[PDB]
């Protein structure tokens, strides 16, 4: 006990990549629904 292990560096890059990839995936759905609404009238 009291080892004070640090989650340190680029583990956070995977954490950041989660947020970035999810922000990608939501905008894809925006493009789908807007592009389909274009061929509605």
Curated annotation (Swiss-Prot):
Protein name: Voltage-dependent calcium channel gamma-2 subunit
Annotated compartments: Membrane; Synapse, Synaptosome
Membrane spanning residue stretches: 13-33
Residues of the full protein shown: 170 to 208 of 323
Top-level taxonomic group: Eukaryota
Quaternary data: The L-type calcium channel is composed of five subunits: alpha-1, alpha-2/delta, beta and gamma. Interacts with the PDZ domains of DLG4/PSD-95 and DLG1/SAP97. May interact with GOPC. Acts as an auxiliary subunit for AMPA-selective glutamate receptors (AMPARs). Found in a complex with GRIA1, GRIA2, GRIA3, GRIA4, CNIH2, CNIH3, CACNG3, CACNG4, CACNG5, CACNG7 and CACNG8. Interacts with GRIA1 and GRIA2. Interacts with MPP2.
Function, as annotated: Regulates the trafficking and gating properties of AMPA-selective glutamate receptors (AMPARs). Promotes their targeting to the cell membrane and synapses and modulates their gating properties by slowing their rates of activation, deactivation and desensitization. Does not show subunit-specific AMPA receptor regulation and regulates all AMPAR subunits. Thought to stabilize the calcium channel in an inactivated (closed) state.
Involvement in disease: Intellectual developmental disorder, autosomal dominant 10: A disorder characterized by significantly below average general intellectual functioning associated with impairments in adaptive behavior and manifested during the developmental period.
Distribution of this protein across tissues and organs: Brain.
Homology family: Belongs to the PMP-22/EMP/MP20 family. CACNG subfamily.
